[PDB]
Amino acid sequence: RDRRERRLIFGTIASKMSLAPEADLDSLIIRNDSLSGAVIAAIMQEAGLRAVRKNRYVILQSDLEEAYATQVKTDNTVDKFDFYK
Amino acid sequence: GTGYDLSNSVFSPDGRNFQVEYAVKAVENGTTSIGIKCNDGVVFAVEKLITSKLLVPQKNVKIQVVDRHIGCVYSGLIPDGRHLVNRGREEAASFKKLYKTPIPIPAFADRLGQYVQAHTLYNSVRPFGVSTIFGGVDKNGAHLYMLEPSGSYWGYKGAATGKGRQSAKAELEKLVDHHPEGLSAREAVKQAAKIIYLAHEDNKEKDFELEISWCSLSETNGLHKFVKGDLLQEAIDFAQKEI
Amino acid sequence: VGVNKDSYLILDTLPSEFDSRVKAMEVDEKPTETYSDVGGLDKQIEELVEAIVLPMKRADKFKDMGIRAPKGALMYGPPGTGKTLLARACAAQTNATFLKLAAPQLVQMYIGEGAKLVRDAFALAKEKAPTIIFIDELDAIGTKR
Amino acid sequence: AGYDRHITIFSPEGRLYQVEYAFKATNQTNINSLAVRGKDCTVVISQKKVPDKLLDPTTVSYIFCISRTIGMVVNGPIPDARNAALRAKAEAAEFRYKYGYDMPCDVLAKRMANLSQIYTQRAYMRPLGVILTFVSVDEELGPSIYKTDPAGYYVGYKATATGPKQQEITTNLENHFKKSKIDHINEESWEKVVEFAITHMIDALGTEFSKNDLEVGVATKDKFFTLSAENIEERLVAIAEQD
Amino acid sequence: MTDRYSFSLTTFSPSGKLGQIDYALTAVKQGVTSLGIKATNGVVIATEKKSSSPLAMSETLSKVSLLTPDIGAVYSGMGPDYRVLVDKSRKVAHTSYKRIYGEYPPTKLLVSEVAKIMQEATQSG
Amino acid sequence: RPDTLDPALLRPGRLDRKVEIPLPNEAGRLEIFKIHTAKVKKTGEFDFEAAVKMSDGFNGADIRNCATEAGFFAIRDDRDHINPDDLMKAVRKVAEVKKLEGTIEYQKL
Amino acid sequence: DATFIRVIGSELVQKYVGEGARMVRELFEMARTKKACIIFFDEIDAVGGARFDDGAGGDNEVQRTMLELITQLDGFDPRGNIKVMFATNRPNTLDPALLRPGRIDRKVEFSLPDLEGRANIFRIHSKSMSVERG
Amino acid sequence: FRNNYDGDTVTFSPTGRLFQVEYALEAIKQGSVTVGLRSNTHAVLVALKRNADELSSYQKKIIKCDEHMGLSLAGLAPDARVLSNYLRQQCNYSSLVFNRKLAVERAGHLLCDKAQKNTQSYGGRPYGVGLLIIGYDKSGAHLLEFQPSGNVTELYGTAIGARSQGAKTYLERTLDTFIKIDGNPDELIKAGVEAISQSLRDESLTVDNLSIAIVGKDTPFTIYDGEAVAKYI
Ligand SMILES: Nc1ncnc2c1ncn2[C@@H]1O[C@H](COP(=O)(O)OP(=O)(O)OP(=O)(O)O)[C@@H](O)[C@H]1O
Numbered sequence A: 001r002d003r004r005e006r007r008l009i010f011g012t013i014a015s016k017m018s019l020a021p022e023a024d025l026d027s028l029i030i031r032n033d034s035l036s037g038a039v040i041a042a043i044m045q046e047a048g049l050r051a052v053r054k055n056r057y058v059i060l061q062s063d064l065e066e067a068y069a070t071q072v073k074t075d076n077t078v079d080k081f082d083f084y085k
Numbered sequence B: 001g002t003g004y005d006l007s008n009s010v011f012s013p014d015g016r017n018f019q020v021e022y023a024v025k026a027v028e029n030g031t032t033s034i035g036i037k038c039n040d041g042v043v044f045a046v047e048k049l050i051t052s053k054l055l056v057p058q059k060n061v062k063i064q065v066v067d068r069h070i071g072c073v074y075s076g077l078i079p080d081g082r083h084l085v086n087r088g089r090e091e092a093a094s095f096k097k098l099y100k101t102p103i104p105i106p107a108f109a110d111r112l113g114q115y116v117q118a119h120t121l122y123n124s125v126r127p128f129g130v131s132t133i134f135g136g137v138d139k140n141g142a143h144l145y146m147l148e149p150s151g152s153y154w155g156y157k158g159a160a161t162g163k164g165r166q167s168a169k170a171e172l173e174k175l176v177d178h179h180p181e182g183l184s185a186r187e188a189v190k191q192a193a194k195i196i197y198l199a200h201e202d203n204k205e206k207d208f209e210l211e212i213s214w215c216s217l218s219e220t221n222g223l224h225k226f227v228k229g230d231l232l233q234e235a236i237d238f239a240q241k242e243i
Numbered sequence C: 001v002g003v004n005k006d007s008y009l010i011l012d013t014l015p016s017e018f019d020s021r022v023k024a025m026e027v028d029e030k031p032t033e034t035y036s037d038v039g040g041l042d043k044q045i046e047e048l049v050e051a052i053v054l055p056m057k058r059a060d061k062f063k064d065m066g067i068r069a070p071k072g073a074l075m076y077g078p079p080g081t082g083k084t085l086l087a088r089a090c091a092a093q094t095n096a097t098f099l100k101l102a103a104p105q106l107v108q109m110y111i112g113e114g115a116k117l118v119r120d121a122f123a124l125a126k127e128k129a130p131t132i133i134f135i136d137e138l139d140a141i142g143t144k145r
Numbered sequence D: 001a002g003y004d005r006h007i008t009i010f011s012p013e014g015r016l017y018q019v020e021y022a023f024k025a026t027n028q029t030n031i032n033s034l035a036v037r038g039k040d041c042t043v044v045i046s047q048k049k050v051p052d053k054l055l056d057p058t059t060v061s062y063i064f065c066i067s068r069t070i071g072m073v074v075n076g077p078i079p080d081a082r083n084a085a086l087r088a089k090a091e092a093a094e095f096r097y098k099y100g101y102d103m104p105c106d107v108l109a110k111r112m113a114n115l116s117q118i119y120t121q122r123a124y125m126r127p128l129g130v131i132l133t134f135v136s137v138d139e140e141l142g143p144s145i146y147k148t149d150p151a152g153y154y155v156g157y158k159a160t161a162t163g164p165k166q167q168e169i170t171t172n173l174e175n176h177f178k179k180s181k182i183d184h185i186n187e188e189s190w191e192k193v194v195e196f197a198i199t200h201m202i203d204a205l206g207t208e209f210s211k212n213d214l215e216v217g218v219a220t221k222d223k224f225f226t227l228s229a230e231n232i233e234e235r236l237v238a239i240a241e242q243d
Numbered sequence E: 001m002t003d004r005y006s007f008s009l010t011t012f013s014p015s016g017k018l019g020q021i022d023y024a025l026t027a028v029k030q031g032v033t034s035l036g037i038k039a040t041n042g043v044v045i046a047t048e049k050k051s052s053s054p055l056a057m058s059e060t061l062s063k064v065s066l067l068t069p070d071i072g073a074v075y076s077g078m079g080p081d082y083r084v085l086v087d088k089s090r091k092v093a094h095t096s097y098k099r100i101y102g103e104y105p106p107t108k109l110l111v112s113e114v115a116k117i118m119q120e121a122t123q124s125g
Numbered sequence F: 001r002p003d004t005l006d007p008a009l010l011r012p013g014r015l016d017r018k019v020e021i022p023l024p025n026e027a028g029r030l031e032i033f034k035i036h037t038a039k040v041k042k043t044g045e046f047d048f049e050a051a052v053k054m055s056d057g058f059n060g061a062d063i064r065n066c067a068t069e070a071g072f073f074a075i076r077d078d079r080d081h082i083n084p085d086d087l088m089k090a091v092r093k094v095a096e097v098k099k100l101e102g103t104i105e106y107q108k109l
Numbered sequence G: 001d002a003t004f005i006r007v008i009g010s011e012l013v014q015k016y017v018g019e020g021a022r023m024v025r026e027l028f029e030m031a032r033t034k035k036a037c038i039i040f041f042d043e044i045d046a047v048g049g050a051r052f053d054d055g056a057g058g059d060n061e062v063q064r065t066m067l068e069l070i071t072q073l074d075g076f077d078p079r080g081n082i083k084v085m086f087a088t089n090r091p092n093t094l095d096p097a098l099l100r101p102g103r104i105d106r107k108v109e110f111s112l113p114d115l116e117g118r119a120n121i122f123r124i125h126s127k128s129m130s131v132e133r134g
Numbered sequence H: 001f002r003n004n005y006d007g008d009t010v011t012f013s014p015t016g017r018l019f020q021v022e023y024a025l026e027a028i029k030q031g032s033v034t035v036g037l038r039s040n041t042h043a044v045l046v047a048l049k050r051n052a053d054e055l056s057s058y059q060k061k062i063i064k065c066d067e068h069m070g071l072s073l074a075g076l077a078p079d080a081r082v083l084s085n086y087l088r089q090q091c092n093y094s095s096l097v098f099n100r101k102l103a104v105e106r107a108g109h110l111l112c113d114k115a116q117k118n119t120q121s122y123g124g125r126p127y128g129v130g131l132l133i134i135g136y137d138k139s140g141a142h143l144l145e146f147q148p149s150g151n152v153t154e155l156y157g158t159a160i161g162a163r164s165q166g167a168k169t170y171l172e173r174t175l176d177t178f179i180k181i182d183g184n185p186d187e188l189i190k191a192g193v194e195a196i197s198q199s200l201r202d203e204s205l206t207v208d209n210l211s212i213a214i215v216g217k218d219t220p221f222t223i224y225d226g227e228a229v230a231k232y233i
């Protein structure tokens, strides 16, 4: 859940891949979730697949933003009911 | 936990109220009753089942009248519909008392629906087990609404509840398709007799008795009355002709 | 395949062997009920015979129509209205294997024995095709996940 | 004991189970709707699903005009929606009578949310099964979209989604709102916002609409009304020829 | 017809503790983390507005409200319950002091008076 | 029922992209009707728009069941090919039975 | 003069799943092996739970045993002179399928005796004892 | 035995029936036979009273609510008092406000409307009493069969009670016979007495077992008991 840990691991995964220069992972990690050390790699895999679908061979920020919406939506629990808090 | 159907206001885990569903299932165990929305007005129809011949013919009726232009035909728990139409008559009387204009059909629908749902909010009241095909003619035209025990009503161009509910709706669709531009009341009454006969085929084991009534502007000029004389016999033997 | 005890030569092949419970559940004597002993069921009898019996004697009509015959018919109802007697009459009138099956009979001891038994039941049904399986009291294994 | 889940009582996890199950009842009709906020007006568009051909399309609608200035779109089972519509209309009447000026949308939304809260707190009552979206234009505040819930949690929205695919439409609109950094659509004409909403809804649901699949409600300055079928067909034709 | 639930829904457990009270405490301890501290020349009460959906407007929702131009209120439990509580408390404060005494009640009596409503809620059936 | 799945098995990395097959929606159902009612001996201008409207919440194989029931209804009158008003009866009959099934609920993982 | 196989209700509740069904099946096979047999299913309140759902699948094994018994009593095969006696103190909690005729025909009503019944009970239980005459 | 869904009256069975009402109807069945019938111009009620022991009495199974109406009993005695009182209130209200004698169908509608409000709301219980309303208005002789379910229908004749419904066949075989009998009260009463005799199982009809009422234009509602009924035995 620490911002520094997610930043470190996101950078580690991004370094091997082909992130575009105009793509910010800090914009992806603005919100503090319970993101695991594995989902935050499958999200980048999904972003890469999304970029490949649009024939782009280098992933952009617009695909990283969409990847967050498809691999991490909710844990359900009670956040689906706002009136509890 | 169990017992989600013991009470009324309790919600099931999928969000569906359960006593209302049982009331719906109780509705289907009732006499079939159809209604046709002809161009000028509406045409009701009922299939009051003749029990042991001790019952007097042509005396027991089920098409109750509200005011002059609203008719009520009910199936399922007949007394519950009796009480529902009683409250509806009281509401129409109050409206005509304090507005001096005959109650329009959608307003009567709103009143009856609000009453019906008032009985599926609490834990100390049993939901109504009657579905009505109430309709009639007003200033703006003609309307035919079916009310369901859940409190949901819709402006049908034709509806039917009872044992032969499913069979009746197929012939309703066939009639609507055959006459897309509209239908006259005179032919509508004969078609209603035919539809009831087709639906009654499921209950051929027991004897039948047909009663029909229609509210219209062309002939009845906004008055509700039954069908008596040669017209009923003509509809009966026309519908028996194709059989 | 049968095989010798010591030389292990393949002496002769054998027919496929199912679980011994599956052999027993096949009906052998046809229960004498007939449709004349069941009364008050006319719509139900017509619906069942035209969905389980008709696409077994005159399937050529369905093949000409190019339509898939229904797999099976559920027979839900209140207790004691003929849900089982109708099956007895159907087994009497039909001319195909009528393996009976009580659902609790499927539930068994060890992990996967029930699955093996219920797979062998359908394998035997396919072997002596056509068939009418009669899984009875389905609520014994059909409870919600 | 086990009677906790039946009535509105707290749970070992500190939860109100009945209110939680009430939300699952709002998706029975699986009708997806969304409302955007224009520069000077508001438009709300909802799917119009007519199940049977016997239905009259005109009478079947989940959009109720509360007053001459406040419109409302409600998702869930219709009878409870009509109960809420009746209470909302009566309360708008009472407020206009008592205070003499037309009420803003937020006041009505807060009052209905308070009513729903009273429903939840009282054990003998059951919570409302609907989700109401209040939409209006406030000369004192501006265009506004207000969405309550069965629990009573109401809050103004830049753009509201609902239905089974509420989340997907929410992200679809959020990408546009986070790229354009504006709290409302910059289109001055109510003509343009209708096509904007329809285009986004089509891209979100992945479906193509006809004259009868969708019903659009428009709230301009001191005016709320529901567009007829020909209006929706003309809008769809304009969208098709434009893109 | 009326209300058939005239019996109290809070029953003493055999352990000697109220059920619904110890259940509402659990419901409170989870949720928005609010706080307030008192200084010599004033009192500051703070809370964080958890924006549920980013398309919503936290401006419309009032996490803190004005009981009186002197006394404010901050909550940490359920939204609608706090809203109904704040409306009722404003009404009863007006009735008790503005109508009878002519000014705004002090904090000490207003707090007891608003807690009267909640301590009646745990009692009334 | 993806809910009753071990979270270790559900982790992204073991089970990658979780393709979800939803209930057919409007235009999708028209494709189902065209596919399943192409081998049948059609004898009319089979505009499935009414069936598409009424088959709300229908799930795939159910549409094939409407085709099968329409074929049955055609047999009931000894006709050798289904009629456009016999599909309507089958759709209604299947839709009535659909109430027997539990109200299918599922959460997008 | 016939075999009187006795069955206590709790005995039909084994540990491993499905063992009650085997219990009942083997019991009925043994009963059918003999020319005339009487079975005294007793305290069937134990395996008598009405079919119900609670999400957690509560005591579904006892239900499985009960349905196996119901199928054995009247299924796709006649019983074969296996007259069966049930006995319980709370017949309310019995599944209506068991109460259905075909597997239970007569429902006796052993109830509290009247004054004459009490006198007969006293005479029967005081046939012995050195009771004072008068 | 009673099941889980018995509870209170406001509860639906999964099949879709009210067990309370069914129990009320069973209690209706358990009561004694009170077969009644009507002609074009006459209405006849025949009741078989029950005595606890030899040194006992007989229930007035024929209750009069007006000169042009009458009641019969096929169940719980005390609730019959409430039902008869309500019917008398409405008859007197009609007399004092409309001057119009209460129509028989209107009386049945009022009775069913009353019987509903116990089965519709919590705290009430269905009226386990079965009324056979007879009467004669300007339209003609009428007869009804009230039930706790609120069902009210008009019939030429019926019989509610223990094995009373076994005496319906006698009416059905002679349904075409007693209809065409007008202005002949004694023979119609004799036919009714023959009808009830078919429902006897253990003991025959005597002076103190037969209670007979009859109404008409020339014959107002009169209750026959004691030696006045022995002529029809
Ligand atoms: N229509 C009918 N005609 C003749 N007998 C019938 C009919 N309906 C039921 N029965 C009788 O019902 C008995 C068998 O009932 P059956 O086994 O069908 O009930 P069930 O409720 O389906 O049972 P289970 O759920 O235990 O399988 C027989 O004695 C048979 O005579």
Ligand SMILES: [Mg+2]
Pocket: C080, C082, C083, C084, C085
């Ligand atoms: Mg059976």
